[PDB]
């Protein structure tokens, strides 16, 4: 009977949706996602900023953005090496903004940074001791993505 | 036409279900699951026992339970820090039972434990060297869930 | 109704397929998959060659095979200990072949290897120098699976 088969199909699809959600929750938990907190993931690959943005966007995340000290430390831990943050002053020199919009608030700049060095630096990397340095968007640093809480 | 479309979609569905099962298999393997052994996993978050139970049930798992010295060792290495076990003596003082049911088979109490210290301690935690200490269920410890072999 | 519901379910199936693809991409990323590069994964379990092949087969992968020094180094780093490679001379003693078919191209044999020692050695393990040694297929070494670039 077509209708009974259609109803079973709806149930099969709803069951699959729920199982996929469960799979997504288990993976986030295994990646260290804390309850009600956003999480960070890296493949430890170094690449220019444009590639990190593309990669994270493709995974439905964004380049990691430290909004506070705890998150900064979490990102530093995940990365292990220098890594790009989702913060740049490409739109207007001197005004750092998050890739997702809004003016930069919390910061952890190394002493004497940002300094738009040489020909100019519009991207930001979390470096030694978790401090920040503005650097060329064309330089290759570790790709760290963040996913919603 | 319609009956054919429906049959073709039932086939796509079966294939998708098998593909998701694969994703689950590969994820567990990547997280260290050994052939024929229970899969133990943590996000390294410390919280009260009530929360651990809720979290593990939310992922369709259960709070980690060491049924023997080998599983106890496995849990010890996953947790790294003090972690709640799925065991309590909430029914009868001194009678430790698994949250999933039954009397405790294996145990690894630390010297002078269990002591039901102070106002009482009805939960259990695996601590240094993998030894056990009873503790208040309200205290916050690492959340470690288990999934079937 | 019938046809509308059937059309909706096709949309649901395609949406679910896209979501599962996303989940697989994100899991590959967390597993360390580098852009356009093949990747290796291990659960750190040690088992006989027969079991490694069966396990990787279940996961839709293959026993890790280094096609060059780069891949050889990657497998060495994932395994951490001796691990089996998808290379054997089981068919014809002395002529090592990939389990995936074809004659062994790249090789990194330790001096004096392969020597089919004692009772016989038909499988190959990448040792703690990246160098290779032929060994009994019955011996238990780390299972490292390889997935496509
Ligand atoms: Ca500029
Ligand atoms: Ca600038
Ligand atoms: Ca700078
Ligand atoms: Ca009590
Ligand atoms: Ca007690
Ligand atoms: Ca105690
Ligand atoms: Ca032989
Ligand atoms: Ca041989
Ligand atoms: Ca040998
Ligand atoms: Cl720049
Ligand atoms: Cl208690
Ligand atoms: Cl052999």
From Swiss-Prot, chains A, B, C:
**Localization per record:** Secreted
Q: Where does Ca(2+) 1 bind?
A: 89, 93, 116, 121-122
Cystine bridges: which residues?
Answer: 56-145, 123-137
What sections of the protein cross the membrane? none
Q: Name one GO biological process term.
A: surfactant homeostasis
Q: How is it modified after translation?
A: Hydroxylated on lysine and proline residues within the collagen-like domain.
Name a GO molecular-function annotation. oligosaccharide binding
Where in this protein does the record put region Calcium-dependent carbohydrate binding?
113-121
* Expressing tissues: Detected in blood serum (at protein level).
Q: Which UniProt keywords apply?
A: Calcium, Collagen, Complement activation lectin pathway, Complement pathway, Disulfide bond, Glycoprotein, Hydroxylation, Immunity, Innate immunity, Lectin, Mannose-binding, Metal-binding, Repeat, Secreted, Signal
Question: What is one cellular component GO term in this UniProt entry?
Answer: multivesicular body
- Residues holding Ca(2+) 2: 113, 115, 121, 133-134
Is Calcium one of the keywords?
Answer: yes
Record domain C-type lectin: where: 54-149
Where is this protein primarily located?
A: secreted
Description of how the protein assembles with itself and partners: Homotrimer. Forms higher oligomeric complexes formed by the association of two, three or more homotrimers. Oligomerization occurs in the endoplasmic reticulum. Interacts with MASP1 and MASP2.
The protein's job, in short, is: Calcium-dependent lectin. Plays a role in the innate immune response by binding mannose, fucose and N-acetylglucosamine moieties on different microorganisms and mediating activation of the lectin complement pathway. Binds to late apoptotic cells, as well as to apoptotic blebs and to necrotic cells, but not to early apoptotic cells, facilitating their uptake by macrophages.
UniProt comment concerning the protein's domains: The helical collagen-like domains from three protein chains assemble into a coiled coil and mediate trimerization.
Q: What is this protein called?
A: Mannose-binding protein A
Organism encoding this protein: Rattus norvegicus (Rat)
Q: What is the organism lineage in this UniProt record?
A: Eukaryota, Metazoa, Chordata, Craniata, Vertebrata
């Amino acid at each position: 009977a077509i209708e009974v088969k259609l109803a079973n199909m709806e149930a099969e699809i709803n069951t699959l949706k729920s199982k996929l959600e469960l799979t997504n929750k288990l993976h986030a938990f295994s990646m260290g996602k804390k309850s009600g907190k956003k999480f960070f993931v890296t493949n430890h690959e170094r690449m220019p900023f444009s590639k990190v943005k593309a990669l994270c966007s493709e995974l439905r995340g964004t380049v990691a953005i430290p909004r506070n000290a705890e998150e900064n430390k979490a990102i530093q831990e995940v990365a292990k090496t220098s890594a790009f943050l989702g913060i740049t002053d490409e739109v207007t020199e001197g005004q750092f903004m998050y890739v997702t919009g809004g003016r930069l608030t919390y910061s952890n700049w190394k002493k004497d940074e940002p300094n738009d060095h040489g020909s100019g630096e519009d991207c930001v990397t979390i470096v030694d001791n978790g401090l920040w340095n503005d650097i060329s968007c064309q330089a290759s640093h570790t790709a760290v993505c963040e996913f919603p809480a």
